[PDB]
Amino acid sequence: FPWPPEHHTARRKRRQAPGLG
Amino acid sequence: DARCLVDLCWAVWGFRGAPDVVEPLLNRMASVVVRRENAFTPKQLGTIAFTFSWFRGAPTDTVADFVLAECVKLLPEMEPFHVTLLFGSLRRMRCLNRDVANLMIEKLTDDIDRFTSDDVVGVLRALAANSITRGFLLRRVATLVFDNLDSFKPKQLASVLNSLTLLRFLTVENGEELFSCLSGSLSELPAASIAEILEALTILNFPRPEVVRTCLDLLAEKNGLISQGSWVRDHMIIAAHAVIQFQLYDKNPVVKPLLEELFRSRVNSSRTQHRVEEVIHALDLEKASPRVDVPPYWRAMIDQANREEQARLEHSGLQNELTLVLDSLRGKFQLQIQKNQQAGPYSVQFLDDETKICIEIDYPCCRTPHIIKARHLKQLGYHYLLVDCWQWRRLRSEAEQTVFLKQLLSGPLLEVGRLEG
């Protein structure tokens, strides 16, 4: 049981990447 | 200005054939395009991409990367014609990627409402070529076609029929509905159109071999004899496969030289290997068929293509999805099914030799309906089953998959004797 889900973590990272450079 | 180099792009495209005189000019055009960033429109970007797609080398590579970068930015402002044009261009220049392809397809699905007849034909052709089976997009486009049949020329109708049949999207009733309109202009249609209709009817297994024989006659008349040299490899393979499938040997001696020249020609195709298997096996085993030999290098290349297909099957995850449920079925039928085994001179995805039962999945990549393979396996004594891709997709749960496979397996088990009537 992984937590937080890896897909959620990757999606958050990708959403942050463009706004934060 | 920024249009002088677009006009010069078209001028160089004029030398599309024999692409040698314009090589230095292309070397300069690549630099000009690179240096004129943020100076063209989306459709001028499309024009540059189209012009440089039909060439190879360093300038084409630089234009490739440049259009690949600019397309992501300029996609929202494009129109379906130019979306399809850039899709085809990138597929030609080999710089395409999964994300960009998905973006293009989603844009087209959103822009369905603006599709013209030419856009419909082009998108269907691309989807059929790449075996891109998106149910919702295909349903919308087919609804457009079947609502505006009168708005499509017979050539466009032939192309749409071919694309949908390759996608496995039409039934016999839909094929009849389209052929009713296509019937009036068969003579007027050119060689390529007739070949496309013949391939579509072969894949559909049209219940009236009369139209198949008529299409064969028109194709033969339009392309002439083999000595004329007008036949194209795809047309020859189509005619031979149709003849072998529909058992027109008694009426197609003229196909014998066509097969001779087909086998004499070298092999470089990537998706006709299945049909080449089918014709090879029919020629070797069906004595009534035209008698032509098969070069050993033909046979070896066909075997290598089979091995590559096996590698692709192993890579695909659908195989494991079917394997799990087949293993689960052992509790009821104890079938010791195995992978990539031999059932006669064919290679089969799933085989259980104890009960002589072979199972395969009907991928869109195959241009054949596998009817010849099924008939030959029946003659050799193997019970052959093929799973329709759409019907397999329909099932959502393992229970539904188990019921579907139970229904598929019920038939042969009676013949093998593992079940009582």
Binding site: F1, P5, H8, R11, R12 | -
Partner: protein, 162 residues
């Protein structure tokens, strides 16, 4: 509504400040209004703090309006403002910012954030956006737009169901 609740300011500060509106008061009806005051309402959502012409003043609010120079709308200027009940007039925005002391180190602003809030309230009553915010022209990744993870027990239950 989605666009309005996300607009980013673009006009110049001077042009914005030239648009000041003096407060105008009108009483509510004797009974109840047939609807809500809809100056900045889209689809039932108030997308902006709106000055209320229909306030019912109590003793405290009336005292503030009558006595405090900061509420004397006939002598109000966006660049020179009184704070709450002050009698001193402060330069805006020069007095809202921290400054360096005789040692060259940072010092808190002459107007604290609490009084800057009163200046902001005066601006809003005068129908002016608060243009002196640090990042006025920048869009914000609003807290409500973040994707939420549901309760961890839901994921545990899904894992156990699998």
């Amino acid at each position: 509504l989605q666009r309005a609740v996300r607009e980013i300011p673009w006009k110049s500060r001077q042009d914005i400040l030239r648009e000041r509106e003096r407060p105008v008061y009108a009483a509510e009806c004797r009974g109840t209004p047939r609807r809500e005051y809809s100056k900045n309402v889209i689809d039932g959502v108030r997308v902006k703090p709106t000055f209320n012409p229909f306030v019912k003043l109590n003793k405290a609010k009336r005292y503030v309006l009558d006595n405090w120079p900061s509420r004397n709308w006939d002598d109000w200027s966006p660049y020179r403002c009184y704070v709450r009940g002050s009698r001193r007039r402060y330069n805006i925005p020069q007095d809202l910012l921290p400054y360096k002391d005789e040692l060259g180190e940072w010092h808190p602003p002459r107007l604290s954030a609490r009084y800057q809030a009163d200046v902001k309230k005066q601006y809003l009553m005068n129908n002016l956006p608060w243009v002196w915010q640090k990042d006025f022209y920048e869009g914000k990744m609003h807290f409500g737009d973040r994707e939420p993870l549901g309760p961890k027990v839901w994921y545990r239950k899904a894992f156990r169901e699998e």
